[PDB]
């Protein structure tokens, strides 16, 4: 139904506010904020949000505390100031999906429409994207297991509208822009193998742990498509792709003649001015 | 009509074989070679300025 | 085409430099643009090794 | 020869050398052997006849290198008579002396006694090109880019005084 | 109809001989098969055009596959002459077989193996293969990473 | 066979199926007719080249070979990342 | 006699046989792609070191 979402950095900055207004208690749970956004277009667009006092129990996961009156009052006053945005979904800032989150989700599946869930991180030490849109849908399973609410990842992008760019860019003065050429290309080309390395190494090690030490339907079926597509690249023999390397290598030779020739043209004013300025300022110096 | 290049082909007398092929990327070596020839007068006229200014 | 299209302008320049050499009248520099053209042209070189890494593993 | 440079000093320099350096390619043994020493005055008075005495039996090697630039099969009358060399043994023998060079490409075959060669002078165009002008790219870019160093540092030698 | 539907296994029309023959014989249903053969020449044109139409149609089906059924072998499995297969090729040149490969040397044909531009074709294959490996690799990765959360 | 001459031939198929070579074209046409396989063979002289099919059941040898080529791919990508990155960070950063 | 123990080749039915002649399988292009990648590293170096 929905292919992608758009989450503005304002709400994650309000998750910085989630970690601001704590007051140092010793709890630091997955504090839930009431996500607001635009379900109106087929794409989901988050503008802003707020948060609600939410408590679980230490031992019991299934005890969870929300408010309808706080939702209708904060959403009521927010709709009074801006009715162009409505309720859409929610989020917890914990790294882990609890068992209770189907029931916590179910309250906003009832009163709000089909609500989206966002897992983000309490400490932004993850190099990966912190935000993951998990659609709250029940899907029919091939094994015959009974149908339950299933959180499939909807792909996400983090974009800012107009002024959030200006304010963020004014606050940083540290980030550099697009800046094609040597640096912004070559830095992605520096850390890029580390970026698939920590992804893959972060996945296949504990994945391999859940191979031998795991049960309880880990989606054993998607391992077959998984390993299948992984064996759709069986270390290509390159024999047809040799001429492709002649092609990129011949384009490389074009970059050779352009670099050599054009830099050699830049040598002109250099190797004129080096003589004609120095010897004339010298010969009229005395 | 191969000699007037109305289409792609080349014949044979021993074997009687026809082969049909084409060369689409014509505009690479053109702009490359003309960039070389136009840079020739840059370097040579530079050497006329420098051969002027030294000796 | 922009390179050669400037090279037809720099074809005429060594006569001017072969006459006057005193004072500069053109705000057009012809150099740093072509440096930028080379920087955009080096994306081929930088991504060729990227292709080498993907082809490797 | 002297092709692109016109000055009448090298011209008079090769004015003795011209008949013999044109006598290189056709490579006629008994005639040109007389031709060298015949008007040999200053090039054979230049000392000790060394590389011309290597030339005197380099004649048939450069001529048979022109045979390598010609067709494959070696006849016993046509091209053996044409190389002034009339025997079955010395034909394959001295052709084989061109084979032990490695400068050529040839296929030593005896089916009926005739000697073949594949004589493939096919260039690397669609024959391992990446590995071929691989080294051309590396060396050429090193020369062009050390020339880029040679247009970096002398402007440092310009702006040094000021 | 379902045999004419799709993915036609190259089937024997002698099996269709009794189908059309009793399709003339029975008056239980589709009685005007004798009207299909009503005119002396017209039903014969429908019939040769019919066998023709399916014997071109199945070639357009196996022409999707690059599996190279090697038409000199196919003319032997079809029990028909290669000269009327040249006539079939006369129906193919007007049926736009114009992207194909024939042989002076062999009689085996190729419906593929173009000039294959690596900046176009192996470009395209490398693109969708590499990218689909990346993003299909991406999804069940974090999805199973959510599946292992529920075991706790 | 995961790699190392993925290409195969009809003799193992017909030896698996005790079938003649006249029917193996019908057999692979049926196999493509199901749609579990996409493999199209560009052979003239008879060959069986394959593409995608679904494993769908289990194989512990492909669990272990999965760990093998998987870990191998991981240490190769790590090896190239350290390899480029060691001199690369020191000259570019 | 000596060349059967010196060369150590195959001696056929009244013929002298030549093996290991132009038999070599070409390269994988992967290791020269790695050294070309090192060339790209040194092109980033030599193009941009002093900068």
JSON list of C-alpha atoms in Angstrom, two decimals, chain D residues 7-66:
[
{"chain": "D", "resi": 7, "resn": "UNK", "atom": "CA", "xyz": [69.56, 20.46, -43.67]},
{"chain": "D", "resi": 8, "resn": "UNK", "atom": "CA", "xyz": [72.42, 19.99, -46.16]},
{"chain": "D", "resi": 9, "resn": "UNK", "atom": "CA", "xyz": [74.91, 18.70, -43.58]},
{"chain": "D", "resi": 10, "resn": "UNK", "atom": "CA", "xyz": [73.25, 15.40, -42.75]},
{"chain": "D", "resi": 11, "resn": "UNK", "atom": "CA", "xyz": [72.48, 15.21, -46.48]},
{"chain": "D", "resi": 12, "resn": "UNK", "atom": "CA", "xyz": [76.19, 15.31, -47.36]},
{"chain": "D", "resi": 13, "resn": "UNK", "atom": "CA", "xyz": [76.79, 13.02, -44.39]},
{"chain": "D", "resi": 14, "resn": "UNK", "atom": "CA", "xyz": [74.60, 10.30, -45.93]},
{"chain": "D", "resi": 15, "resn": "UNK", "atom": "CA", "xyz": [75.66, 11.08, -49.55]},
{"chain": "D", "resi": 16, "resn": "UNK", "atom": "CA", "xyz": [78.02, 8.08, -49.34]},
{"chain": "D", "resi": 17, "resn": "UNK", "atom": "CA", "xyz": [75.64, 6.14, -47.13]},
{"chain": "D", "resi": 18, "resn": "UNK", "atom": "CA", "xyz": [72.54, 6.36, -49.35]},
{"chain": "D", "resi": 19, "resn": "UNK", "atom": "CA", "xyz": [73.32, 3.64, -51.90]},
{"chain": "D", "resi": 20, "resn": "UNK", "atom": "CA", "xyz": [74.10, 1.11, -49.19]},
{"chain": "D", "resi": 21, "resn": "UNK", "atom": "CA", "xyz": [71.23, 2.05, -46.87]},
{"chain": "D", "resi": 22, "resn": "UNK", "atom": "CA", "xyz": [68.86, 1.61, -49.81]},
{"chain": "D", "resi": 23, "resn": "UNK", "atom": "CA", "xyz": [70.83, -1.56, -50.54]},
{"chain": "D", "resi": 24, "resn": "UNK", "atom": "CA", "xyz": [69.77, -2.82, -47.09]},
{"chain": "D", "resi": 25, "resn": "UNK", "atom": "CA", "xyz": [66.18, -3.74, -47.89]},
{"chain": "D", "resi": 26, "resn": "UNK", "atom": "CA", "xyz": [66.48, -5.58, -51.21]},
{"chain": "D", "resi": 27, "resn": "UNK", "atom": "CA", "xyz": [69.49, -7.32, -49.67]},
{"chain": "D", "resi": 28, "resn": "UNK", "atom": "CA", "xyz": [71.33, -8.75, -52.67]},
{"chain": "D", "resi": 29, "resn": "UNK", "atom": "CA", "xyz": [74.38, -10.61, -51.36]},
{"chain": "D", "resi": 30, "resn": "UNK", "atom": "CA", "xyz": [77.03, -10.75, -54.10]},
{"chain": "D", "resi": 31, "resn": "UNK", "atom": "CA", "xyz": [76.31, -7.32, -55.57]},
{"chain": "D", "resi": 32, "resn": "UNK", "atom": "CA", "xyz": [76.08, -5.27, -52.37]},
{"chain": "D", "resi": 33, "resn": "UNK", "atom": "CA", "xyz": [79.07, -7.05, -50.84]},
{"chain": "D", "resi": 34, "resn": "UNK", "atom": "CA", "xyz": [81.01, -5.52, -53.73]},
{"chain": "D", "resi": 35, "resn": "UNK", "atom": "CA", "xyz": [79.10, -2.23, -53.36]},
{"chain": "D", "resi": 36, "resn": "UNK", "atom": "CA", "xyz": [80.11, -1.58, -49.72]},
{"chain": "D", "resi": 37, "resn": "UNK", "atom": "CA", "xyz": [83.88, -1.98, -50.08]},
{"chain": "D", "resi": 38, "resn": "UNK", "atom": "CA", "xyz": [83.69, -0.69, -53.70]},
{"chain": "D", "resi": 39, "resn": "UNK", "atom": "CA", "xyz": [83.25, 3.00, -52.92]},
{"chain": "D", "resi": 40, "resn": "UNK", "atom": "CA", "xyz": [84.03, 2.31, -49.26]},
{"chain": "D", "resi": 41, "resn": "UNK", "atom": "CA", "xyz": [86.33, 5.17, -48.36]},
{"chain": "D", "resi": 42, "resn": "UNK", "atom": "CA", "xyz": [85.32, 6.98, -45.18]},
{"chain": "D", "resi": 43, "resn": "UNK", "atom": "CA", "xyz": [82.72, 4.72, -43.61]},
{"chain": "D", "resi": 44, "resn": "UNK", "atom": "CA", "xyz": [85.15, 1.82, -43.98]},
{"chain": "D", "resi": 45, "resn": "UNK", "atom": "CA", "xyz": [88.01, 4.16, -43.08]},
{"chain": "D", "resi": 46, "resn": "UNK", "atom": "CA", "xyz": [85.99, 5.12, -40.00]},
{"chain": "D", "resi": 47, "resn": "UNK", "atom": "CA", "xyz": [87.52, 2.14, -38.29]},
{"chain": "D", "resi": 48, "resn": "UNK", "atom": "CA", "xyz": [87.71, -1.66, -37.93]},
{"chain": "D", "resi": 49, "resn": "UNK", "atom": "CA", "xyz": [84.60, -2.49, -40.08]},
{"chain": "D", "resi": 50, "resn": "UNK", "atom": "CA", "xyz": [82.63, -3.77, -37.08]},
{"chain": "D", "resi": 51, "resn": "UNK", "atom": "CA", "xyz": [78.93, -3.17, -37.54]},
{"chain": "D", "resi": 52, "resn": "UNK", "atom": "CA", "xyz": [79.26, -3.30, -41.31]},
{"chain": "D", "resi": 53, "resn": "UNK", "atom": "CA", "xyz": [80.94, -6.69, -40.92]},
{"chain": "D", "resi": 54, "resn": "UNK", "atom": "CA", "xyz": [77.94, -7.69, -38.82]},
{"chain": "D", "resi": 55, "resn": "UNK", "atom": "CA", "xyz": [75.82, -6.14, -41.55]},
{"chain": "D", "resi": 56, "resn": "UNK", "atom": "CA", "xyz": [77.39, -8.38, -44.21]},
{"chain": "D", "resi": 57, "resn": "UNK", "atom": "CA", "xyz": [75.67, -11.41, -42.72]},
{"chain": "D", "resi": 58, "resn": "UNK", "atom": "CA", "xyz": [72.82, -9.35, -41.29]},
{"chain": "D", "resi": 59, "resn": "UNK", "atom": "CA", "xyz": [71.75, -8.87, -44.95]},
{"chain": "D", "resi": 60, "resn": "UNK", "atom": "CA", "xyz": [70.03, -12.25, -45.23]},
{"chain": "D", "resi": 61, "resn": "UNK", "atom": "CA", "xyz": [68.57, -11.90, -41.72]},
{"chain": "D", "resi": 62, "resn": "UNK", "atom": "CA", "xyz": [66.88, -8.58, -42.44]},
{"chain": "D", "resi": 63, "resn": "UNK", "atom": "CA", "xyz": [65.87, -9.90, -45.86]},
{"chain": "D", "resi": 64, "resn": "UNK", "atom": "CA", "xyz": [64.38, -13.01, -44.29]},
{"chain": "D", "resi": 65, "resn": "UNK", "atom": "CA", "xyz": [62.73, -10.64, -41.83]},
{"chain": "D", "resi": 66, "resn": "UNK", "atom": "CA", "xyz": [61.11, -9.09, -44.88]}
]
